[PDB]
Every structure is written in C-alpha cells, then in structure tokens.
C-alpha cells in the first residue's frame, strides 16, 4: 500500500484500451495497392570525415546538411555539388548529436561532455563562433532540436529532458518521468508537443507549455533508440535494439503495426518517414538500412552499403532525396 | 563548364579539404588510453601521478598521450561504450587490499570479465594495475588469509597470494593475440609512466608485426 492502487489503475486503463480497439489491422487496407519494389541508387558520396560519424540533419532549404563525427569536426555540405561550405572545430571531440536551426542561421551540437553548444553561422567577420554553452545537464547529451531561433529542446542521460532560453541561458522547463536514460526525441509539425524514448522501454509524449507528461506508451521489449513523427503530427514510430519497429497513435494509445522479420537480428539506429508517410525507413546494425511500407508491413526495399554501420538517416522537407551516414566515415545521397 | 562563383566556391572547398586532411594527419600520431577503474580504486592516485569526460594529455619521451577517464558518467556504459572502440589500450586498476567491504574482489573480477569479453572492443590489450601494496601486505600479516576466495590452498605470505590473485585476473581471457600487462603499485612509486610506456611500445610492435603479420 498504496502500490497496489497503481497496479489497479494500470489494470483498468489497459482493459479500457483493449475495449476501445478492435482492429486488426490484419485485413484492413489490403484493398490499397502495394507500392511494389522500390529501387534506390547512390547519387553522391560525401567523403570528408576521418572517423565514425554519429548524426546528421537537413536544412529547411533541402540543400544544405550538417554532419558530426568523432574526429571533433562539423561539416556543412552542399548536397547538390558536394562542396564543403564550413568546417567547424569542436572544443570536445566526443560529440553525439547535431541539429540545424529552421532559420538556417544557427547550428547546435553536443555529446559526452554534458553541455550543448550553439554556433552562429551569419557573422560580420565571416567565421563561425560560439554563442552559448548550455550547461545544466548531468548525463551525456543525446539529442537536440530547435524550437525556433531562440528555443531548443534537449535530452540527456539524466533520464530527463529540458527546454532552454538561448539568450538567457537558463533551463525554463524540465521533464522528469522516464526513470531511465533517454535516447532520442522529435518535434511535432504543430511545434507544441514532442516525444522521447528511453532505456526504460517506454515512450512519453510531453506538452511544451504544461511541462508534464500526458501519454505513456509501452509494450516494447527493450531499449528505444530513435523516434520520428508522422507527417501530419498524429503518430510516431520507434526503433530499438530489439530488432523490431513499431508505431503508436496518440488518440488511440495503442500499438498499431509491428515491423519485424525473422532474418533480421540486430538493433535499429534511426527511423524516418517519407513526405507522404507511405514509406518508413530505418537503419540497422547489419550494415544496411531497410525500407518498410507504412501499413502493409513488408520490407519493400533495401539499400546497399555501407561497410558499417548505418547510424543516422534523414529525409529532406520536399522529400526529394534521402541521406545516410555510418561508422565508415561516408555519407550517401539516395534518390 | 561552371561559372566564376562556382569556381571560387570549389576553390574554397578544396582549401577546406586540404586543411582538414592535414589536421587529421597531424592528429593521428598520438596514442589514446582509456582509464577504467572501479570505486575506491587508485585511479585517482594514478592520475595525480600523471562533470562529464575528463581529458588529460601529456608527453613522455617525445610521445604524446591522451588519457580519458569516464568516472563522472553515472549512466549505463552499454550505451556510449562504443565510442572508445578505436583505442590503443585500456588501463584497469583494482585493490588489494580491500576485499571484505561489499564483495570487492568479486565485483572487480566480474567487471573485468565483462569488459574483457565484448562484441567490439575485443582485440585491445589491457594494462592492469594492482595498487596499494602496503595495505594488502598488512591485511595478511594481521588478518590472514582469509581468503574471500575459498580453496586457495597456498601459503600465507606474500608473493603466493599476490601471484594467486594476479593469475586469477589473467584468467578469463578467451582471446589469443591480446595480452594483459600487470604491475604492482605501492601508491608511492614514480616509474609507472615507464611501465605504461613499455606496454604501449610492446603493443605498437605487436600491431606492426601484425600486418604480414605473420602474427
């Protein structure tokens, strides 16, 4: 007591979710035509880095992208022409994430040093400079996303997420419910809700203004390593070292479909959706990333390379292309 | 062909590439070491001998060392352990004396086994440090043996027990072509740098011999 009250609450909430759903989602949507076999081809190969690369992010122009690698450098690429725009030397080489501001004026990186650095791209002196050193966290940084030109959300090893005010430099909100190291997060296109996955094998949606968890999703056997929203901001999918991918509905509070195959036994390092949401992409520990139809749940396609190991991938805003990175220090643009 | 603006941009990109490659070449010379203790082990003593990760770099006999000790990281090491996969060697320290505190030897041994058998990170030789000699010396001439290890079946003092626990550590090493260098530290010596240097040069020789190699 009163620990039994909590399990009773879990019981009625689970039974209510079971009652509120019947589909299955086993025979539904069989009417719509399968998209068939999708072929992808490498179009460019960006080969500047000298060590494992750990994260990448697209700009809003859908032409520039930034990549972060363990050799302690940041690169801004011109994906159209494979030219390097800027090279940024990091203070601490143990970087684990990066993010591109929507306005295109700022870029952020962070990692195993517990602090998040903000870099200014448009200066009078024609060079990049540090603007802030957001240092409130205790565990290592895991992910960063720009809310706007002066608001950034972060996740760390403190089993918590934070919301900052870049000009002020003070944590203006905190989220403290995961009870386990959190690994990733993504922002809804509404730009008012976000979700985060943790090593506790559960996912929780947050309210930016309220600062309190609203819905908790579970039923996933191991760690969670990647999340991304549905294009309309009404769903999201999760990766894992469980070798299984799954998606949830916010208004239904249940799993909808699972993406697993017998041959694949390895973790999942990143996920992303297509512009229409028809194609789900995911990277794996077995050196190649598979492409999954959103709802028919089949491995529609696959991508050759890399040597090892697909650790980060993303899709442009216009959906024109897709990019992947890996521990072999190469980036490939697939179209 | 392509216009003047693109020509200038390509020139800038080539300059960036050249600078980056030169910096990488200059960086590849130094040697990287992971410091990985446990609790009240004398890793702090080793560091002083010389909130997140702490990098200490020094030069010894025209060789540049970079030593990382992830002590403040309280998170799960299964995540983020892969960062130091391309490292020359790791430095492990235990003690010897304390083994009745809960035990200490069992926890250190299981941690050592866990990091000695990893999916990646499997072919990196380990330097082993057994510090605080005098305390372990007194703990036996006063409170033998016990030992926390049963079936020890040996004499009382001193190299008997020392070599026994040492050999216990050189146990549980599945792989060949990977060595464990061991040493005894009195917490007052001043040549641990020399033994680290010797182990590192031995590892370098082993790697060189490795390609044709011709193991």
């Amino acid at each position, epitope marked *: 007591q009163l620990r039994q009250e909590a399990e009773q609450l879990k019981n009625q909430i689970r039974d209510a979710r079971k009652a509120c759903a019947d589909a299955t989602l086993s025979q539904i949507t069989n009417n719509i035509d399968p998209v068939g076999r999708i072929q992808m081809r490498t179009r460019r190969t960006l080969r500047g880095h000298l060590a494992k690369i750990y994260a990448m992010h697209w700009g809003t122009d859908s032409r520039l992208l930034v990549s972060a690698s363990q050799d302690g450098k940041l690169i801004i690429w011109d994906s159209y022409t494979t030219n390097k725009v800027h090279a940024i030397p990091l203070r601490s080489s143990w970087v684990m994430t990066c993010a591109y501001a929507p306005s295109g004026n700022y870029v952020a990186c962070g990692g195993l040093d517990n602090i998040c650095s903000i870099y200014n791209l448009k200066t009078r*002196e024609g*060079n990049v400079r540090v603007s802030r050193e957001l240092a409130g966290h205790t565990g290592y940084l895991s992910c960063c996303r720009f809310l706007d030109d002066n608001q950034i959300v972060t996740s760390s090893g403190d089993t918590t997420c934070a919301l900052w005010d870049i000009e002020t430099g003070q944590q203006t909100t905190t989220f403290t419910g995961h009870t386990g190291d959190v690994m990733s997060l993504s922002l809804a296109p509404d730009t008012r809700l976000f979700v985060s996955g943790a090593c506790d094998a559960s996912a929780k949606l947050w309210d930016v203004r309220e600062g309190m968890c609203r819905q908790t999703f579970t039923g996933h056997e191991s760690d969670i390593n990647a999340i991304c929203f549905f294009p309309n901001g009404n769903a999201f999918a999760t990766g894992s070292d469980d070798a299984t991918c799954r998606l949830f509905d916010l208004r239904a509070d249940q799993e909808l479909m699972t993406y697993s195959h017998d041959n694949i036994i390895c973790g999942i390092t990143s996920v992303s959706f297509s512009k229409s949401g028809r194609l789900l992409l995911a990277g794996y520990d077995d050196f190649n990333c598979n492409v999954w139809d959103a709802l028919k749940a089949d491995r529609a396609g696959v991508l050759a390379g890399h040597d090892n190991r697909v650790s980060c991938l993303g899709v442009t805003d216009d959906g024109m292309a897709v990019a992947t990175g890996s521990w072999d220090s190469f980036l490939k643009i697939w179209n | 062909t392509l216009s003047a603006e693109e020509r200038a941009a390509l020139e800038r990109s080539k300059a960036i590439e050249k600078n980056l490659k030169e910096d990488g070449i200059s960086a590849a010379k130094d040697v990287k070491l992971l410091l990985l203790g446990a609790g009240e082990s004398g890793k702090s003593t080793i560091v002083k001998q010389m909130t997140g990760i702490v990098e200490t770099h020094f030069t010894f006999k025209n060789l540049h060392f970079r030593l990382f000790d992830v002590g403040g990281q309280r998170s799960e090491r299964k995540k983020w352990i892969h960062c130091f996969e391309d490292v020359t060697a790791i430095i492990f320290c235990v003690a010897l004396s304390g083994y009745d505190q809960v035990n200490r030897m069992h926890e250190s041994l299981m941690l050592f086994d866990s990091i000695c058998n990893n999916k990646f990170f499997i072919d990196t030789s380990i330097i082993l440090f057994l510090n605080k000699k005098d305390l372990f010396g007194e703990k036996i001439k006063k409170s033998p043996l016990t030992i926390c290890f049963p079936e020890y079946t040996g004499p009382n003092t001193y190299e008997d027990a020392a070599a026994y626990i040492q050999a216990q550590f050189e146990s549980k090493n599945r792989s060949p072509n990977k060595e464990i260098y061991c040493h005894m530290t009195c917490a007052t010596d001043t040549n641990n740098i020399q033994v680290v240097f010797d182990a590192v040069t031995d590892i370098i020789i082993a790697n060189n011999l490795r390609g044709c190699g011709l193991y």
Partner: single-chain antibody
Amino acid sequence: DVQLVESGGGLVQPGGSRKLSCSASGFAFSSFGMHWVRQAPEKGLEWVAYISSGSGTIYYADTVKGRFTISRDDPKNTLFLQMTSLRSEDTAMYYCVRSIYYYGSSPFDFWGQGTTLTVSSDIVMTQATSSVPVTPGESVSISCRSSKSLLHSNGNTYLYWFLQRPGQSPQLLIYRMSNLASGVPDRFSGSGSGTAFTLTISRLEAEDVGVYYCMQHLEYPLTFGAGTKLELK
C-alpha cells in the same frame, strides 16, 4: 568593427611608380577575396584587379595588365597594389572591397573609404537615362541593360546593385538581383528578366538620394553600368 582604411596615393609625375595599401581590421581577413575598383574623377566605376582567398587565382583588367600587380600578406592583414609606368588617365579614385564566395554568400558587401590619385568581347552594361526627377514619399524605378543574358544554367542571375550617396563610399543593396543586403531597409526590391532588369522604391525619403550602379558577375572581366542620379524637385 569591420573597417578598411587605405592611403598610398598622391601627386605623381607621369611614368612613375607607386604602391597602394589598405589595412583590414575587425574581420577574418585571411578568408576573403579582395578586389580593387577605380572611379574616375567625374563619374563612372570600373573593376581593376582581384586576388583569391588563398592567393591562388588572380585576374586583371585590360589596361591594367603588365603594369599593375596585386599582392596580399594574410598574417600582416594588408592588401598591396603596385603601380608602374602610370599613364595620364590612371588618375582616379580607388577602393578595396572584400568578398567571400560560398553558397548563399553576399560578395562586395563592404567597401573602404577610398584614396585619391593625381598625375601630371566583354559584356556591355547599359543604363539610361542618367537622371530622373522625384519627390520624397513616392515610388520610382531604375532600369539597367546588358548584352548577354545573365541567367546561368544554375538559375542564378548574377546582377548586383550599388548606391553611392554623395561624399561617401558606395554600398551594396541587391545581390543576384533578387536578394537584399543586411542592414538595408526593406522598401528596396529588385527584379528583372534574363537580359532586362529594374528596381522598385516605396516610400522614398531624403536618405536615399544619390547615384546607383548595376554590376554583373557572370564572367570576368567585371563590368559596371553607367551612373544614374536622383534629384529633389
């Protein structure tokens, strides 16, 4: 902050030799390409030389070649222009301009205060006429003409616009004939076809009276248009 100061000029008898220098402060000089632009005592602007960021590429004008040379010393933060066998018409006004070229850059953003000198095919840029009467608070448009179409295969139409208020150095207004420079009122707006170009001014005020120029950057040599000035009828 960012500022370029230059003084190496003076009265020189014909056929002499001279060196010009502008000192760079407040910005990463080593990462910029530099130009020299000459202005005749009456009117007009014409490009002279250019040295790349790493001093690996140099260009000259036609009359410049063989007599003038350009050099930089990045650790010293100085630009050099050497005069030899100066002619009669070389007497004019000079400027050194910074410029950096990457994706989405703004070259020719900042100009120096200039220094004066006294002594004793190509793309054609057309502006006409040279004067239009206006009043404050009402609209006005200025048009410039070229010979070849400026639209490159990329989709970038390389046209630039500059304004020089009397008694001071010119400054950048529009780059690539569709963008707006930093620290510029938004009322300015540039547009045009592949060969014909214009401007628009809304709510014109007394600060905007001066002379305007059009420049193209499609291919060396860089060519300027004529000068068109505004009046306050």
